Design a binder for this molecule. Structure first.
Ligand SMILES: O=c1ccc2ccc(O)cc2o1
Ligand SMILES: [Ca+2]
Ligand SMILES: [Ca+2]
Lengths: 432, 430
């Protein structure tokens, strides 16, 4: 089963919004170094044709979201990114065609059949500055298709890319005007204070080292593995944790704790290596003043819980989950402004969180269904980037009743983790 | 506070009535552009779990109420919305929790996590998922039912028939008592020769690129005010001893609020402003609409005046203007309102700027929606886009009563002051 690029149309906006070269600068969250990647993910649709439908809504959306056709480039003074927009810039659209039906591969929900990685362009992050937003429409012989997207993480976070794709989707459904107007103005809203000040909750977590590439660690060839998890086992687990800890845990707390411990123990981490649990959270509604409705840049700070690997692999789950619960306490206006002010002081010092960072990303209850171009919402959605949140092994929560846990793991540790998930799938949680 | 979403159950109909996919046409009342919005409200209950009971009665209801599963699309021949119904479609039921006791949060009267108690889709997103229910549990055994419904599919009394049919099944009804009737393009269709009377022509205008819900007035805040039967009596009686006329609460209080609203917004003296509300016309048509008809069976009634005259003329004149607005409610008024939609849907029908809408929820049987935990103790609307207005106002039921007003940020400081003089009995009636 072989995929085949046919041709690559270069869609400019419908009616040009730019006269001359506007150069937009990016916020101090956009210039995070862990965001100097390209996020690759795809959506699968079942059931006038998808190519022209996507390229039409894209052309019209690019009157408002015109910076997605820009060119990222580093700056003369600071090493920060700035985005170059002009008239004639285009977002490439790849058309592809794989010679099987997608029902034969289970709508790509199960194991990889070989070509999933070619279902969205894979630029190494420097050709991902020239074209920081790339779309692809692969057509299957079934009567069904896939929509891949390679967007540079500095331009937009998850919710920002959601606004853009909801704009394309509604336009394809006959909407007369985009429901929410994009707002840029990122150096105003998310900028550093005049006297930069950083509090303990940020300093206790970040370190400086110009020589540390968080994505360059030699931990081996990393693999992608999905796992189904039922609402039955979660309630089984939340209740046992309740009998012991006297506290009620969210799914993200309790399932995050169990996966963290199973990951660090399977990777045989030294008993006294500092390890970290890291996740993004939206702060748009939390700044004072709150961020505007159409802010589509990065509006998320990373939050952390840290511990020794020895303590993690041996202490009860309900102390680890309690630790993860204590981490979302730090979320505040001062945390974000301290994080921004730390970027202003040490952006060229190589900010990082260290080794043994495991990233967790909850995507279950994004509005995936409303990304509808006329073939229904996506049957399945899949992220491919294993470089995320300063981590090389990021874990995704994805949409007989439960959700899909996607983990990225070093090949050396996948066998024991597959086992630790089967014990979960059997209620043998070994809480201590 | 902390609200978690635990799962989302996609509840399909029990005995799936569709083999063929079915496109259902909506009526010209349904396709009023002022109804292309998602209406969000919640019910709070007190004292075989509410999640399981609601979903079980939801599924059986959807055998007769299957259009609530389908999608809203713009037809090929025109912009007009058609309802795509097919086998396999479902209604999402978000399941959620919060670590409060419901009594801890002053149930839900005293006014901060309510905007999460129900999803908030945009108007286009709302066409993909028109009917979204959400059951949220609180510690001290009690729960909240959230609903986001696209207004093109049904009106107030229409979501009442659907929920009362959910309520009667959850109690143990063997079948549903009233079959729901569609028959929509036949019942509320246009006349072969469209004719539009002056009572409708004087209220609306044509403008392709006017958006009633995208006006640039700033950000709209939401606030409640308790209004006593004490002060209303003193208001109707001082209007009586000054005009000799009798005024209902909806005419006297709605005129005090309309005036204070327009006062606070610093509206230019010669701008036309409007007072709007909907009335059920099911019993007013010749022939009447069936009892099961659950689509939109209401037309907006309007009352208009210059801003400067409204802000300085006596209250009893403004309350008379509203009293006289219900004179226009007839059968031809509805047939004219429909024929106007037939003539000018593509030309952007609207009632212009300055529109303050009002909705009166006090005297509608909110109790009978009983799933097993009694009637809802409180009920709260969350939308602020309604009846072509971005600053709607609600009269909430008897637990005096609470008036819920949506008003732009900059006008709220003087509206609080206005309502504070209403509470003291300083009505300043001219
Ligand atoms: O104005 C209203 C009041 C209640 C209501 C309830 C459901 C609905 O779909 C629309 C509605 O509009
Ligand atoms: Ca440090
Ligand atoms: Ca006066």
């Amino acid at each position: 089963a072989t995929l085949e690029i046919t041709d690559i149309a270069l869609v400019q906006p419908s009616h040009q919004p730019l006269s001359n070269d506007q150069t937009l600068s990016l916020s101090h969250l956009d210039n995070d170094n862990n965001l100097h990647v390209s996020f690759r993910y795809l959506r699968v649709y079942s059931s006038e044709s998808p190519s022209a439908v996507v390229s039409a809504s894209l052309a019209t959306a690019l009157v408002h979201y015109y910076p997605l056709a820009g060119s990222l480039r580093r700056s003369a003074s600071d090493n920060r990114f700035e985005l170059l927009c002009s008239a004639g810039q285009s977002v490439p659209l790849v058309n592809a065609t794989v010679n099987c039906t997608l029902e034969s591969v289970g709508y790509l929900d199960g194991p990889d059949p070989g070509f999933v990685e070619r279902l969205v362009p894979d630029p190494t992050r420097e050709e991902g500055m020239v074209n920081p937003c790339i779309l692809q429409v692969t057509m299957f012989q079934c009567g069904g298709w896939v929509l891949g997207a390679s967007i540079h993480h500095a331009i937009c976070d998850g919710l920002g890319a959601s606004l853009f794709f909801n704009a394309m989707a509604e336009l394809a459904r006959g909407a007369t005007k985009i429901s929410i107007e994009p707002v840029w103005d990122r150096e105003r809203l998310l900028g550093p204070r005049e006297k930069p000040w950083v509090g303990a909750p940020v300093r206790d977590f970040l370190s400086l080292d110009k020589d540390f590439d968080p994505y360059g660690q030699a931990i081996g060839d990393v693999k992608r593995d999905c796992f189904f998890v039922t609402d039955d086992s979660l309630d089984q687990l939340k209740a046992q944790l309740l009998e012991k800890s006297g506290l009620n845990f969210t799914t993200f707390e309790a399932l995050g704790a169990y996966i963290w411990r199973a990951k660090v123990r399977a990777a045989k981490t030294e008993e006294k290596e500092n390890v970290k649990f890291v996740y993004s959270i939206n702060i748009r509604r939390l700044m004072n003043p709150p961020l505007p409705k159409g802010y589509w840049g990065n509006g998320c700070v990373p939050m952390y819980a840290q511990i020794k690997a020895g303590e993690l692999i041996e202490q009860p789950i309900w102390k680890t989950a309690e630790l993860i619960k204590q981490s979302k306490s730090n979320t505040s206006d001062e945390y974000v402004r301290s994080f921004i002010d730390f970027q202003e002081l040490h952006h060229k010092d190589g900010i990082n969180a260290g080794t043994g960072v495991t990233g967790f990303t909850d995507w279950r209850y994004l509005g995936h269904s409303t990304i509808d171009f006329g073939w229904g919402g996506p049957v399945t959605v899949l992220p491919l980037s294993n470089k995320l949140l300063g981590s090389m092994e990021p874990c995704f929560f994805l949409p007989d009743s439960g959700f899909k846990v996607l983990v990225n793991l070093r090949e050396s540790a996948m066998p024991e983790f597959k086992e630790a998930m089967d014990k979960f799938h059997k209620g043998e949680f070994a809480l201590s």
